[PDB]
Amino acid sequence: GVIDTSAVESAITDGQGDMKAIGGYIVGALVILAVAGLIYSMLRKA
Amino acid sequence: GVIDTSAVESAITDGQGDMKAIGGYIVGALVILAVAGLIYSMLRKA
Amino acid sequence: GVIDTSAVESAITDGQGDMKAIGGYIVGALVILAVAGLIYSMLRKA
Amino acid sequence: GVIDTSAVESAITDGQGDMKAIGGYIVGALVILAVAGLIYSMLRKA
Amino acid sequence: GVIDTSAVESAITDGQGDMKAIGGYIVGALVILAVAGLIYSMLRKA
Amino acid sequence: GVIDTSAVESAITDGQGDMKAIGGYIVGALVILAVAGLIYSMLRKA
Amino acid sequence: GVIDTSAVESAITDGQGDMKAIGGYIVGALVILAVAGLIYSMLRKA
Amino acid sequence: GVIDTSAVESAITDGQGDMKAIGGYIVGALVILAVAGLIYSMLRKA
Amino acid sequence: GVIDTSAVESAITDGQGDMKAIGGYIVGALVILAVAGLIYSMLRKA
Amino acid sequence: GVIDTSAVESAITDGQGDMKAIGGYIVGALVILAVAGLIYSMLRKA
Amino acid sequence: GVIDTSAVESAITDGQGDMKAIGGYIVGALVILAVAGLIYSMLRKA
Amino acid sequence: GVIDTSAVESAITDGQGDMKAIGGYIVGALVILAVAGLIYSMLRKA
Amino acid sequence: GVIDTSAVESAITDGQGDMKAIGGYIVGALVILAVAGLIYSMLRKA
Amino acid sequence: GVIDTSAVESAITDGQGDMKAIGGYIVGALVILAVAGLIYSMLRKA
Amino acid sequence: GVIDTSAVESAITDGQGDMKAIGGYIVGALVILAVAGLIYSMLRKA
Amino acid sequence: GVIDTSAVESAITDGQGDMKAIGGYIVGALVILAVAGLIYSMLRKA
Amino acid sequence: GVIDTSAVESAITDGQGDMKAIGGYIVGALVILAVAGLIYSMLRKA
Amino acid sequence: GVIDTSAVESAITDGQGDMKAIGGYIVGALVILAVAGLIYSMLRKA
Amino acid sequence: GVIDTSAVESAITDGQGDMKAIGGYIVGALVILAVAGLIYSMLRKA
Amino acid sequence: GVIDTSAVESAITDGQGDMKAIGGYIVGALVILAVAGLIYSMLRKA
Amino acid sequence: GVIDTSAVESAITDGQGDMKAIGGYIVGALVILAVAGLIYSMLRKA
Amino acid sequence: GVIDTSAVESAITDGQGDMKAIGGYIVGALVILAVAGLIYSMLRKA
Amino acid sequence: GVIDTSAVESAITDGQGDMKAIGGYIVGALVILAVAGLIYSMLRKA
Amino acid sequence: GVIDTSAVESAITDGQGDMKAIGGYIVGALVILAVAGLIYSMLRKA
Amino acid sequence: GVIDTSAVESAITDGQGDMKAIGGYIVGALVILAVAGLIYSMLRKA
Amino acid sequence: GVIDTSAVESAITDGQGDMKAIGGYIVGALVILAVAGLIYSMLRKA
Amino acid sequence: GVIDTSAVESAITDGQGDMKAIGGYIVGALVILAVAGLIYSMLRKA
Amino acid sequence: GVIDTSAVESAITDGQGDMKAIGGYIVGALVILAVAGLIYSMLRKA
Amino acid sequence: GVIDTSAVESAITDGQGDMKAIGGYIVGALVILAVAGLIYSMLRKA
Amino acid sequence: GVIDTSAVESAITDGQGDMKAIGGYIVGALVILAVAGLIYSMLRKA
Amino acid sequence: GVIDTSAVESAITDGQGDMKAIGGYIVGALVILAVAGLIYSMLRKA
Amino acid sequence: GVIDTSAVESAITDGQGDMKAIGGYIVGALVILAVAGLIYSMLRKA
Amino acid sequence: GVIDTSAVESAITDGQGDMKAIGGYIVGALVILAVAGLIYSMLRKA
Amino acid sequence: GVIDTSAVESAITDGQGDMKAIGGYIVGALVILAVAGLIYSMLRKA
Amino acid sequence: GVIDTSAVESAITDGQGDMKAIGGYIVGALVILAVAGLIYSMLRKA
């Protein structure tokens, strides 16, 4: 007997993939915010 | 008399197996989410 | 199986864009403040 | 003997289809929310 | 067989719409706050 | 997808404007102070 | 289908209004402080 | 043969109606909360 | 058929009311804080 | 021949009635819960 | 025929009552928290 | 239906009160500092 | 019928009590901080 | 003819009784949880 | 007839007990956090 | 919808008032210092 | 959008005015000192 | 019912204590700075 | 009946312990910062 | 006559036993989670 | 009779183990964040 | 409801006290400096 | 609303007073110096 | 039984890594700001 | 807006007055010296 | 597993760059101020 | 990624310009004072 | 960007003007003193 | 049970270390500034 | 409960120490300046 | 509550002491200069 | 409120005293010089 | 764990360097001023 | 890392230059005064 | 804990050194001026 749950082992993988994808771009934006701090809070006076 | 329910003792085992399998990959993804937190909420400002 | 999260890879990009846009003009103003310091705190006496 | 359950193998497929369809648009909206965060919480001060 | 879930593909769209609508006006207000900072924290002394 | 942040590109501009406006009059006053120095610290004895 | 979120497009507007209102009077006070500086730090000696 | 389930096609409609009704007023209140934020977190200092 | 959800359309209204009520007094207090700033940070030296 | 099942067509109606009756008061209570949310999660801070 | 469900129309009412009762005292406490904020975050410096 | 939030309209008032109370004494002290300046920075030489 | 929820009307009261208790001592400490400011930022030079 | 089902009219009553009994103590505990929230999420910072 | 549900009236009590027990120690820890704030955010500068 | 922030438009006014009040007396003292200079630095020798 | 900072363009003007006012009288006194020199340091012997 | 928050009434006290402790030594140092001013800005020339 | 929650009364204790541990070292560092202020803002000029 | 259901009175007892057993270890784990919160959300900043 | 639930008493233990494992590394990262604060917000100016 | 902030009305008073105390001794020293001027800048030649 | 800053209008007055007081005695001494000139620079030869 | 959470013990490590990476560069920038202070606030006059 | 600096226009006047007063008596003495020359440096021999 | 945060290692670099850029020009201006001192406070008399 | 801070490299330049402009005229006046010395302190007697 | 400092280039000019004006009359008087020497120190005997 | 937070007791130590390191070099620079004062403001004239 | 802040009572002491140390040497230099005055402004002519 | 600032009342006293000490020796030297005048500007011719 | 500056009214008096003291002895010496003239510029020839 | 702050130990060094550099040239100019005094205030008459 | 302060090493040089320039012409004039003495105080009688 | 400020105890020493160095040469020049007086104001006639 059985239940072919190998289609899972891949289906979930996509997930991790797509996730890690957004899990990048989010950071991608926040850097902008970071750089936007320190640089303009140097221009603040210096 | 009897009822040969030894085919069960294995059939159910597969289950536990396939389960524990998904019971891994789920965690597999959630780690991504974890790392995605702390790291980008370090980049937050620091 | 899948989940077409490629509409994300662009949607988030706009964000970075619009952000970096404000992330400019903010600095755009603060310069004014900078110049407003040193120049009038030269006129201070000199 | 038998029971022609091949009409199932397709009927369920539609399901997955229609599902994955909503399973997209949901994400479609949440991106909006994401972009709405970071960008306006850049405009927050910067 | 089927389930006509095309009424969804539009119903959800409205959502994104109305959302992006508020997702604008929110920023609309926060700008006011931004301008209210830098300008009066120029008037601060200068 | 998007977020119409073009209302920003102008809203912030006003700021710079109003700022540069005060960023003038401040200097406008300090000149008075300058002239008030040198001239009366000529009258000091000469 | 829909969700009548037009009551929003106005409700938020009031906000911007009331905000910009305080966003004025705040500056209204800080000017007092400004004038209170330069003028009495002219009277300082001159 | 049959089962006159056309009384359904309307009975369920009412539902959607009454729902969308509350589905409005809920938002109706949350706007209040929104406006209550930004405006008083402008008055915060500005 | 139906479900008399008109008792809702009013019950929720009270909410908005009571809310907007607190949504006032909160601001009522924060003004105190505002005035407490600028005035005593005028007395700071001036 | 026959079976006078017209006493049914009414007996079942009562049911729908009494049901719709409770089917009201249930909602009657849940509104209380709704109002109890938003209003006190306005008082939360605001 | 019938089913005397009028004992319901009252039994449920009590509920709403007892609910609205707790639905008060909860707010009763949260005010304390509110006042505890603004007042001591005035004492913060002022 | 309702939620007796009139206990709020007073509870918050106390707050404003106690606040305005500290909002006085703070200034009460800073005057001391003010007088301590000008008078001893008269004694400075004169 | 009923549900004796009068044990609530008191149980919640304790809460408010214990809360208001901490809601005092917190302020109790922050005063220390306040006094620690103004007094030593008088000793700052004066 | 008959069937003495008056022993029911009481047997079921006990039920309601014992029920309402647990239907109290359950709430009895949940209050503890309630008080445990607000009070310690006052101690949270305040 | 009956159902001896008096073993309940005690079993549930233990619960409240054990609960209130954790419902203490939780607060027990959070105080530590509180004290850890104010004291070191006095040492912050003072 | 709305938020009655007209109590602000006055509350802030008081501020400006009380401010301008101190914003006078400060100058009131500094004149003393001014007169104390020139007159005694005439008596210096003459 | 905007921030009506035209009340500034005048408020600051007063300043310049009041300043230039003292910026006169100061010189007004110093002349006295000047005349007091040369004339009595003519009377010195001649 | 209850929640033994008397362990708080002491835990917070320690805080005030340790605070007031640093709240002393800080001043302890700043005096040094004070004395270091006036005395050496007497030695300045005298 | 029961639930042996005495393993809690200790498990939570560790927490408080480990916490208070970090709750020390944090302060341990901030002192460094304190000393780093006053001492070098004595060396500032003195 | 009869039915020896005393084998029940014990069989069910085991149940309660084994249950209360898991009914412990579950809590056993959740404590870990609790301690994992407060302690690391002390390390959060403190 | 029985149900061999001793395989539980261990299965759950693993859980606590693996948990406490992540319950460490999480803190492991947050320290990094802590150190990243204080040290660079010493470098801030000092 | 309330928050006993009368412990403040005194705590702040001490402050004013201790302040005015240093606010004396500072002047106490500066007199020394004053006398040290005029007297030795009489001895200057006379 | 308000902030009782009438305690200021007097507190500052004292200042002017004490100032004008020293603002006298300073001149009080300088006369001595004046008389010490002319008289002994008459005795110079005459 | 088990759950292979060893993929965690590494996944989280990366996090710490990438974190400590940004946890460097942040400081990397702030030094620039530091050097930009002291050096140009030496050039200030010296 | 404004700053009532008319109290200045008089305060400074007093100065000029008191000055011109000493600005007389100084000359008053020097005449004595003048007369003391020529007359006794006539008596010199003649 | 991972999170490609190498886009950071460069994004932050730009920051340092742009910063150091302003971190130059600021000094660029202050020199002007320096030269403007010494040279004209040579012309002062010499 | 980036932040277009080239608008700075010019904005600051203007500053230096306008500065150097006043940095001239200041000297422009002081020469007058110089010439006013030596020439009339030649006319002094010669 | 800019800062209209052309109002300076004239404001300072007035200064030079008014200065050179007094820078004349001073000499205007000193000539009197010159002539008063040589002529009466000719009349001295001759 | 537990949570091995001993990796903290060291991780935080590094912090203090690196801090105290910068907490030195900062002073290292400021001395330069100190020496740069007194020595060249000896060369000032002496 | 507690927070071992005795490591503070010493850490701050060092500060006072190191401070008083520089608080000496500063004076150490200024004496040089003092002696450099009077002695060479004796050699001035005598 | 309080802040033991009695360590001040003495710390400042030392200051006055050490000051008055230098405030003597300065005069101590200037006498030398005085005597050095009159005596050698007797020897001048007599 | 106040600042006990009565310790001044005496401290300054001493000054006048000590001054007038030297303001005597200076004349005390110059008489010697006077007598030394006329008498020996009688002995000159007579 | 760690944070590579060795890039600091050098970055700050540059600072000291560049500083000491300006910390030279400043003196470099002031000498000019010194020499410009004594030499031309020898030419004064000699 | 760095800060290109080589633009300083020249900017300051100009200063020294322009200074030494005026540092000449000043002497240039004073010679005139010198020659104007001795020569006409030869013509005095001879 | 500590802050190695022993690099100060030497850095400041250099200062005193370099100072005393200029504190010599200044006198070195003034002697020239002294000798230039008496000797040529012997040659004056003798």
* Nearest of E45, R42, Q19 to residue AE20 by alpha carbon: R42
Rg of chain AE on CA atoms, in Å: 21
Distance CA O3, CA O6 (A): 9
Three-state secondary structure call for residue AA44: coil
> Residues of U18-44 as b/e, b for ≥16 C-beta within 10 angstroms?
bbbbbbbbbbbbbbbbbbbbbbbbbbe
Inter-chain residue contact AG25 with AH9, CB threshold 8 Å: yes
3-state secondary structure of F34: helix
Instruction: Provide DSSP, AC1-43.
Output: ----TTSHHHHHHHHHHHHHHHHHHHHHHHHHHHHHHHTTTTT
Task: Assess contact for A45 and C36: CB atoms under 8 A.
Answer: no
From chain V, the residues in CB contact with R34 under 8 A are 26
One DSSP character per residue, AB6-42 reads TSHHHHHHHHHHHHHHHHHHHHHHHHHHHHHHHHHTT
Q: Which residue has the tokens 């001023």?
A: AG33
**How many CB atoms neighbour CB N24 within 10 A?**
16
Dmax (CA) for chain A in angstroms is 74
Of L27, L38, L46, the CB nearest to W15: L38
In the numeric block, which tokens belong to residue AE26?
Answer: 């300065």
Cα J2 to Cα AD10: distance, rounded to the nearest angstrom: 104
Cβ–Cβ below 8 Å for X34 and AG26: no
Distance CA AI30, CA AI33 (A): 5
Q: Please give the backbone phi and psi of residue Z12, each rounded to the nearest 5 degrees, phi first.
A: -75, -30
Single out the residue of V41, Y27, V32, AF29 nearest to residue W33, CA to CA. Answer: V41
The amino acid present at T36, given as its one-letter code, is A
Q: Are C27 and F15 in contact (CB under 8 A)?
A: no
The alpha carbons of chain Z give a radius of gyration, in whole angstroms, of: 21
Residue of AI33, AI26, AB18, H40 whose CA lies nearest to AA36: AB18
In angstroms, rounded to a whole number, what is the distance separating the alpha carbons of residues AC41 and AI23? 11
Query: Phi and psi of AC39, rounded to 5°?
Result: -70, -45
CA distance C43 to F33: 9
| Inter-CA distances, G13 with E21, E28, G17, P45, U12, Å | 13, 9, 6, 69, 55
Contacts of M1 (CB under 8 A, 6+ apart): K7, K10, K11, K14, N16, N20
Neighbours of AG5 (CB within 10 A): 24
Give me the residue label for tokens 């004008």. Answer: W20
Give the DSSP letter of residue Z7.
S
d(CA X43, CA X38): 9
Nearest CA in chain V to K43: V8
Specify the 3-state DSSP secondary structure of R10. helix
First to last CA, chain M: 72
Q: How far is CA AA42 from CA P29, U13, Z14, AC37, AH36, in A?
A: 42, 103, 62, 36, 8
* Cα L31 to Cα L36: distance, rounded to the nearest angstrom: 8
What's the CATH number of domain J1-46, 1.20.5.230, 3.30.160.250, 3.40.50.10140, 1.10.1740.10?
A: 1.20.5.230
* L39: amino acid identity, one letter: I
Residue whose C-alpha is closest to residue U14's, from B20, Q42, I12, AI36:
B20
Interface chains of chain V (3 or more CB pairs under 8 Å): K, L, M, R, W, AE, AF
Q: Give CA–CA dist N11/N15, Å, rounded.
A: 7
Q: Are M37 and K44 in contact (CB under 8 A)?
A: no
Contact G16, H42 (CB under 8 A): no
Query: How far from each other are the two terminal CA atoms of chain AF, in whole angstroms?
Result: 72
SS3 at position Z42: coil
Alpha-carbon gap, residue X35 to U43, rounded angstroms = 10
Q20-30 burial, b at 16+ Cβ within 10 Å, e below that, comes to: bbbbebbbbbb
- Farthest-apart Cα atoms in chain S, separation: 74
Please answer yes or no on whether L35 and AF8 come within 8 Å at the CB atom: no
Q: How far is CA AE33 from the centre of its chain?
A: 15
- Nearest one of I37, N17, AG17 to H45, comparing CA atoms: I37
Nearest-CA distance U20 → chain B (Å): 15
Q: Phi/psi at S11 (nearest 5 deg)? A: -50, -40
Looking at the partner chain, which of F34, F38, F46 has a beta carbon nearest the beta carbon of AA40? F46
Mutate to test the interface with AB, among C25, C26, C31, C35 (most CBs of AB within 10 A): C35
Contact Z46, AG40 (CB under 8 A): yes
Distance, in angstroms, between Z43 CA and closest chain AG CA? 10
Contacts with P40 from chain L: Cβ below 8 Å: 46
Give alpha helix (H) positions in Q1-46.
8-40
R39 — phi, psi (to 5°)? -70, -45
DSSP symbols for U1-46: ----TTSHHHHHHHHHHHHHHHHHHHHHHHHHHHHHHHTTTTTT--
Chain Q residue at shortest CA distance from E25 = Q1
Q: Considering only CA atoms, which of AC1, Z7, W33, U1 is closest in space to residue S7? A: AC1
Note whether H38 and P2 are within 8 A (CB): no
F26–chain G nearest CA distance, Å: 9
Q: Exposure string (b/e) for T14-46, b if CB count within 10 Å is 16 or more?
A: eeeebeebeebbebbbbbbebbbebbbebbeeb
Tell me how far the alpha carbon of residue R32 is from its chain's centroid. Answer: 14
Decide: AB14 and Q19 in contact? Cβ < 8 Å. Answer: no
- The terminus-to-terminus CA distance of chain AB in angstroms comes to 72
Q: Distance from CA of residue B20 to its chain's centroid?
A: 5
Please work out, in degrees rounded to the nearest 5, the angle formed at the alpha carbon of residue E42 by the alpha carbons of E38 and E44. Answer: 115
Rounded Cα–Cα distance for residues O8 and N44 (Å): 35
Please tell me the distance from the alpha carbon of residue W23 to that of residue J42, in angstroms, as a whole number: 58
Residues of M in contact with N34 (CB under 8 A): 11-12, 15
Distance from CA of W17 to the nearest CA of L (A): 9
Separation between Cα atoms, residue Z42 and residue R3, nearest integer Å: 77
Residues listed for chain W: 46
Report the alpha-carbon distance of residue R39 to residue R32 in Å, rounded. 11
Q: Is residue V41 classed as helix, strand or coil in its secondary structure?
A: coil
Cα separation of AC15 and C14, whole Å? 38
Query: AD42: distance to nearest CA of chain AE, Å?
Result: 6
Q: How far apart are CA AD12 and CA R30, in angstroms?
A: 11
Residue S3 region by backbone torsions, left for phi larger than 0, else alpha for psi between -120 and 50, else beta: beta
C38 touches chain Z (CB under 8 A): yes
**CB of Y38 less than 8 A from some CB of W:** no
Q: Which of R4, I4, AF23 is nearest to V44 (CA)?
A: AF23
Dist CA L12 CA V1 (whole Å): 9
- DSSP secondary structure of C1-46: ----TTSHHHHHHHHHHHHHHHHHHHHHHHHHHHHHHHHHTTTT--
Distances E46 to C46, I42, Q10 between C-alpha atoms, Å: 17, 15, 17
> Is residue F24 less than 8 Å (CB to CB) from chain AB?
yes
Q: Which residue has the tokens 């009160």?
A: L17
State how far the alpha carbon of C38 is from the alpha carbons of C32, Z24, AA15, AG23, in Å. 11, 14, 7, 21
Asked if E2 and D7 touch (Cβ cutoff 8 Å), the reply is no
Residues contacting residue O1 through CB under 8 Å, at least 6 positions apart: N7, N10, N11, N14
Q: Please tell me if residue U39 touches chain AG, with a CB cutoff of 8 Å.
A: yes
Asked whether the beta carbons of AD32 and AI18 are under 8 A apart, the reply is: no
- Is the separation of the CB atoms in F46 and AB23 below 8 Å? yes
Is J32–L8 a contact, with Cβ atoms under 8 angstroms apart? no
Distance CA AH35, CA AH24 (A): 17
Whole-number Å distance between alpha carbons of V15 and R17: 17
Give the length of chain N.
Answer: 46
Q: CA M43 to CA L35: how far, in whole Å?
A: 14
User: Rounded to 10 degrees, what is the CA torsion of AC3, AC7, AC10, AC12?
Assistant: -70
DSSP code per residue over G1-46: ----TTSHHHHHHHHHHHHHHHHHHHHHHHHHHHHHHHHHTTTT--
Token duo for residue AC45:
């004239």
Q: Is the Cβ–Cβ distance between AE18 and V34 less than 8 Å?
A: no
Sign of CA dihedral Z9, Z15, Z19, Z22: positive
DSSP assignments along S1-46, one per residue: ----TTSHHHHHHHHHHHHHHHHHHHHHHHHHHHHHHHTTTTTT--
**Cα distances (Å, whole numbers) of residue E41 to I28, K34, P19, Q11:** 24, 29, 18, 17
Q: How large is the C-alpha radius of gyration of chain I?
A: 21
Q: Tell me the three state secondary structure of residue H27.
A: helix
Which one of AH3, AH11, AH22 has the shortest CB-CB distance to Z31?
A: AH11
Residues of M in contact with R8 (CB under 8 A): 18, 21-22, 25
O30 at interface of M, judged by CB pairs closer than 8 A: no
Residues A15, A19, A22, A24, CA torsion sign: negative
The two structure tokens encoding residue T18: 């084994």
**Backbone phi, then psi, for AD4, in 5-degree steps?**
-65, 80
Alpha carbon of H8 to those of B37, E4, H11, H13, H14: distances in Å? 47, 17, 5, 8, 10
T35, S12: Cβ pair inside 8 Å? yes
Are the CB atoms for J40 and K26 separated by under 8 Å?
Answer: yes
In chain L, residues with a C-beta closer than 8 Å to the C-beta of W5 are: 24, 27
**The residue type at W4:** D
Element (H, E) at X12: helix X8-38
Give the span between the Cα atoms of X7 and T19, in whole angstroms.
Answer: 32
- The per-residue DSSP string of AI22-42 comes to HHHHHHHHHHHHHHHHHHHTT
Q: Closest chain G residue to F30 measured between Cα atoms?
A: G38
- Asked if residue G2 lies in contact with residue H24, where contact means CB atoms within 8 angstroms, the answer is no
**L19 vs K45: CA distance, rounded Å:** 12
Instruction: Name the one residue in this structure whose structure tokens are 């886009």.
Output: Z7
Chain Z interface includes X7 (CB < 8 A): yes
* CA–CA separation, H18 and G41 (whole Å): 68
Distance of CA A29 to the CA centre of its chain: 10
Query: How far apart, in whole angstroms, are the C-alpha atoms of residue G15 and residue G18?
Result: 5
Measured on CA atoms in the order AI39, AI41, AI44, AI45, is the torsion positive or negative? negative
Q: How far is CA X2 from the centre of its chain?
A: 37
What contacts Q41, CB < 8 A, 6 or more positions away?
none
CB proximity list for H32: less than 8 A, separation 6 or greater = G11, I16, I19, I20, I23, J42, P1, P3
Which residues are CB-contacts of I35 (< 8 A; sequence separation ≥ 6)?
Answer: L23, P11, P12, P14, P15, P18, W1, W3
**Contact predicate I15/H27, CB 8 Å:** no
Question: Does Q3 contact E39 at a Cβ distance shorter than 8 Å?
Answer: yes
User: Which residue from AA4, D12, N31, O26 is spatially nearest to S15, judged by alpha carbons?
Assistant: O26
Q: Which residue of AG has its CA nearest to X18?
A: AG3
Tell me which amino acid residue P42 is: M
| Closest CB to U25 among X2, X12, X30 | X12
Output the furthest CA–CA distance in chain B (Å, rounded). 74
Is residue K1 classed as helix, strand or coil in its secondary structure?
coil
**CA dist., res. D43 & res. C29, Å (int):** 13
In contact, B14 and A2? CB cutoff 8 Å? yes
**Quick check: AA38 contacting AB, CB < 8 Å?**
no
Dist CA J18 CA K1 (whole Å): 12
The amino acid sitting at AF29 is A
Do AE26 and V36 touch, CB atoms closer than 8 A? yes
Q: Is T42 helix (H, G, I), strand (E, B) or coil?
A: coil
Half-sphere exposure of AG32 (CA within 13 A, CB side): 25
Strand residue runs (E) in Y1-46: none
C-alpha–C-alpha distance, residues AE19 and I15, integer Å: 70
| CB-closest option in O24, O28, O38 to R15 | O38
